């Protein structure tokens, strides 16, 4: 997904919890949520 | 040398009493099941 921000704009944050649909990859790996795994997150600015 | 050859033993009406397969015994026919056997699959999915 993407995150919006810029030097001119001021502080912000969401109280709620953004939700993402991740069923297909779990079905692919045959990995139930209770099994052993982890996530890896990468963040990259627009300017590269 | 085989793709246009009758395929045993479904040619014989005495051996096999089902006329449809006997008529469609040509191995060329197996690809055109959609137009000769009209049986389909639920989905072309494979491992999600």
């Amino acid at each position: 997904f993407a995150v919006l921000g810029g030097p001119l704009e001021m502080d912000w944050h969401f109280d709620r919890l953004f939700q993402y649909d991740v069923t297909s990859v779990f079905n692919q790996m045959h990995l139930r949520p209770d099994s052993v795994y982890h996530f890896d997150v990468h963040i990259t600015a627009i300017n590269g | 040398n085989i793709m246009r050859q009758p395929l045993k033993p479904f040619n014989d009406k005495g051996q096999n009493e089902f006329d449809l397969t006997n008529r469609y015994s040509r191995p060329i026919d197996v690809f055109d099941y959609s137009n000769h056997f009209d049986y389909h699959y639920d989905t072309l999915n494979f491992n999600s």
Binding site: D34, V36, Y37, H38, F39 | -
Partner: protein, 48 residues
């Protein structure tokens, strides 16, 4: 994914007890039947 990790330090070898060592997890901790302790009267101000 956070209610699955082993509960330190109860997974160590410095655990004098043997029963909780192998089921010192978050999911299996929701039942007190295997922990052998029980309550007398769990009523709330006499309201049940």
């Amino acid at each position: 994914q956070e209610l699955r990790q082993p509960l330190e330090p109860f997974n160590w070898d410095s655990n004098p007890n043997d029963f909780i060592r192998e089921n010192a997890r978050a999911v299996d901790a929701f039942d007190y039947d295997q922990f052998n302790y029980q309550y007398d009267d769990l009523n709330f101000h006499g309201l049940t």
